[PDB]
Amino acid sequence: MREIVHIQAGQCGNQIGAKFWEVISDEHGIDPTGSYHGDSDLQLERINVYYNEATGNKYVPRAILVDLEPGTMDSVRSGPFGQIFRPDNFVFGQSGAGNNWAKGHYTEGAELVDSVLDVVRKESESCDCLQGFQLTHSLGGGTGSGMGTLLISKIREEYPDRIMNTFSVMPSPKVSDTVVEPYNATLSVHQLVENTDETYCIDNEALYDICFRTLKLTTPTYGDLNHLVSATMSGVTTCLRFPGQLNADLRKLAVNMVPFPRLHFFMPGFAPTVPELTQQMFDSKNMMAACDPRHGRYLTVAAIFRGRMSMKEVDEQMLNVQNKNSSYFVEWIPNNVKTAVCDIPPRGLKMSATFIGNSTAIQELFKRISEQFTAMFRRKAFLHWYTGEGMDEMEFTEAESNMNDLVSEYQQYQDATA
Amino acid sequence: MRECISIHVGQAGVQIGNACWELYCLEHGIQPDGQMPSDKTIGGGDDSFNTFFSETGAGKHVPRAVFVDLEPTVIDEVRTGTYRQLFHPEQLITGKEDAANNYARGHYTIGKEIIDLVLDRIRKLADQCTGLQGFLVFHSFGGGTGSGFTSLLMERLSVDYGKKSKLEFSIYPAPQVSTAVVEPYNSILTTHTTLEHSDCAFMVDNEAIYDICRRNLDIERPTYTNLNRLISQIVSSITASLRFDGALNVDLTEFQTNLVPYPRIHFPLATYAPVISAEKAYHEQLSVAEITNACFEPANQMVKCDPRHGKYMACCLLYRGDVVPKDVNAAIATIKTKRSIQFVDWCPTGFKVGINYQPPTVVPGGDLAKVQRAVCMLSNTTAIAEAWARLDHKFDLMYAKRAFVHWYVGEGMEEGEFSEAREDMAALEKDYEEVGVDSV
Ligand SMILES: COc1cc(OC)c(Cl)c(-n2c(-c3ccccc3)cc(=O)c(C)c2-c2ccc(F)cc2)c1
Ligand SMILES: Nc1nc2c(ncn2[C@@H]2O[C@H](COP(=O)(O)OP(=O)(O)OP(=O)(O)O)[C@@H](O)[C@H]2O)c(=O)[nH]1
Ligand SMILES: COc1cc2c(c(OC)c1OC)-c1ccc(OC)c(=O)cc1[C@@H](NC(C)=O)CC2
Ligand SMILES: Nc1nc2c(ncn2[C@@H]2O[C@H](COP(=O)(O)OP(=O)(O)O)[C@@H](O)[C@H]2O)c(=O)[nH]1
Ligand SMILES: [Ca+2]
Ligand SMILES: [Ca+2]
Ligand SMILES: [Ca+2]
Ligand SMILES: [Ca+2]
Ligand SMILES: [Mg+2]
Ligand SMILES: [Mg+2]
């Protein structure tokens, strides 16, 4: 009875979240109508974490769909699992955000934010013991970034003692389709650094490379990329959704993954013999964030293996990776690599592994955005679009300072010794 | 509803509007009488094509457009033309006497008689909108109506609608294509009066479209119909994102935010590819990467200038048709490797992209061949300052001797407005030089 309230905002948030509900609905064996037609009772032991039990034994996700542009709502509602969701949980506007963070955070999103919190109060009050919230959104746009972080700030006011998770698609180093994304990303990161307990960094360029270089898709699409992200989201939340040797929640994950409150930005991975999975799983080629783990040290790591597989074999292989490449792990957090196993594998797979790393190498990402942010901000390029919504330049300078301070923090523990 | 109201001012704007709304009807399957068989949402709906068309209970799809001209000859043809019943009589506004190539007559003398009426009809269209997004204003620089009345309208729209988006489509004069001696004066006066009220202006050098039509389409001696049909392809590409549903399209706000780095620097350079005849399109297909490369060849720009000698500040690439993301990303990846295409150092990420899978449409009669993938690029480049310089020079030659100025003073203007408008242009030219200078 540790329920999670899911929220998805913006195109990216809704497209990624919609595919996420498709994935776990299959894992819990729930059809688009919301009725269970599975085989094992282990699919239901912890189903109330992500679903409400409705009259007629229909299952309804604790999902809240948000955007300032109604177009993406209609796509969700007409998608494979469109009619699963609660009609009243579609909270949308008509104006859109125009890739403008200020519109999403201060004007257009501020008009709609209360309506979203009202839907949150419904869901949260209908929870035996509310555990926390999870958000899926992009940082480069205006709604998921600007309004997304506004929703986070408001939720922390009502629920200051609850856990806030996010799955944030970050700007990629070379692939971009938004000219002002450095402004939007830097403004969002300064919000995420303060009002989130855990943030999974997702990079579309890395996801595209996997789809193209590895999976051999000659014409990858956002559907293919979303499938990879959804597969990772299911893998991360496997322990929250299924029983097993591990009985842990989101707060325990944060307590053990975050040695310092601001450094809570994780590097996700996914794979694909047991030895070969652990080899893949730690590979740069399998990392969902555009940062080389070899360019830093892991503060903490979490690995989840799924499917019938030799436990002792995994333990030996994991322990080998730690001891073999121990120079990439901080020496002052003893036993900072923990592993969990679940008997239920995903669809069309016999074995799978999900990776969650709190690596100091993630500062490379915040370096990039800072340098891109400064190049535009020095010349106040495109700024009038933000000051026109009522922002002041000082709010831009503060975000620049904070993300540089965050970058400064990461470098501190990347060279710390015992 | 994200509606957009089109305003077509003067002969050029009206005649350009004739080609655009003809194309729109062909792209949406709307018949000359306004009936749209494929539309089952009779009397209304939230469809994407309702941003430009309103519905009536009788199944009539009516353009959200106003046509204004100070003389009736041009709009009279619309009232008796093939799309005569597409529009409503109230939407086709005309006076009896034109501005006579005089900005002052269009702005001060003949314009005042009709401006209050025009705003009322625009008001009537606005009241029918649930979420009006902005205005599209089609006009020439050279004509007295297109220059003088448009300026008047833009100022009045800012008072009655505040900061609501206002985008222009402006015809930059050229000696090849039926220009007049005083058109440099009108262009400078209207640009200065409209600079502070327009959020994004799309100039089209009439010499550039004359050349493209004469070279790419092998039309020895282009007509206004040949030019307007080409212009409508660019207008269609820019508004396709608004008239059609899609997951990868660029709405106006998204469109303006990623293309205008500073309020005054809002004159993107438009290109379209492929512009090709049927004879050449026979047994010939061009790919995504090919049309992407053509967008950066100065020979295809809608305004004559040399991007190679300037710097890019933002590029918007609107693909349409049989275009897949993988090809788009590869084609743009190549452009970023080309050191021949220089971006300002304060634009680390300078590409906005979109795809509209609806295929390009050709007027049955329009020299363009029907292709399957097309791209319209809109780039904010310093090179566009070259067009300002050419026009500013022609202004200086005449104004040094005060040639023709008496025609404007007779209508109530002062020579001070001429120099003020010229100084604003001088600041703009210096502005384009400043933004192109490398950072410290
Ligand atoms: C993030 O900025 C982008 C820039 C870009 O071209 C410069 C593209 Cl094609 C995409 N993009 C699009 C798309 C987006 C906006 C307009 C049109 C198409 C759709 C799509 O399904 C996929 C997979 C991608 C994509 C993602 C990550 C990559 F590494 C490579 C391609 C994204
Ligand atoms: N592309 C294009 N340009 C046009 C067209 N008609 C006129 N022009 C341009 O417009 C200029 C002449 O001004 P007009 O727009 O025709 O004059 P007006 O707006 O009707 O104002 P008046 O002075 O009162 O006649 C010329 O320099 C032409 O280059 C047209 O149909 N297509
Ligand atoms: C009465 O009908 C005429 C009216 C005009 C013109 C003209 O001579 C071609 C006429 O024939 C008699 C004309 C005058 C010459 C101009 O420059 C000297 C000009 O730019 C202006 C032109 C005409 N405009 C154009 C594009 O030819 C408009 C004025
Ligand atoms: N994975 C994924 N990323 C997306 C998708 N759509 C947009 N993005 C990312 O988000 C950015 C655009 O922001 P957008 O999603 O439109 O944000 P919004 O304005 O809040 O809706 C791009 O740079 C992409 O990297 C999608 O369908 N899938
Ligand atoms: Ca409002
Ligand atoms: Ca309330
Ligand atoms: Ca309709
Ligand atoms: Ca109808
Ligand atoms: Mg006329
Ligand atoms: Mg978009």
PDB file of C-alpha atoms in Angstrom, chain B residues 1 5 65 143 155 179 226 232 242 248 294 299 313 320 363 415 419 422:
ATOM      1  CA  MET B   1      -8.650  26.660 -31.120  1.00  0.00           C
ATOM      2  CA  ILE B   5      -6.733  35.571 -39.204  1.00  0.00           C
ATOM      3  CA  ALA B  65      -9.512  36.273 -43.955  1.00  0.00           C
ATOM      4  CA  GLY B 143       2.201  50.361 -53.233  1.00  0.00           C
ATOM      5  CA  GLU B 155      -0.494  50.240 -35.411  1.00  0.00           C
ATOM      6  CA  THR B 179       8.003  48.732 -59.752  1.00  0.00           C
ATOM      7  CA  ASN B 226       3.659  32.610 -61.720  1.00  0.00           C
ATOM      8  CA  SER B 232       2.052  30.419 -51.838  1.00  0.00           C
ATOM      9  CA  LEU B 242      -1.213  24.999 -38.176  1.00  0.00           C
ATOM     10  CA  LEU B 248       6.326  16.939 -35.412  1.00  0.00           C
ATOM     11  CA  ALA B 294      19.578  23.396 -51.848  1.00  0.00           C
ATOM     12  CA  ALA B 299      20.669  30.875 -55.784  1.00  0.00           C
ATOM     13  CA  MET B 313      21.559  33.039 -36.190  1.00  0.00           C
ATOM     14  CA  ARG B 320       6.672  18.083 -45.746  1.00  0.00           C
ATOM     15  CA  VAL B 363      -2.368  24.263 -58.430  1.00  0.00           C
ATOM     16  CA  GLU B 415      10.310  65.799 -43.983  1.00  0.00           C
ATOM     17  CA  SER B 419      14.798  61.276 -41.941  1.00  0.00           C
ATOM     18  CA  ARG B 422      15.839  56.624 -42.553  1.00  0.00           C
TER      19      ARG B 422
END
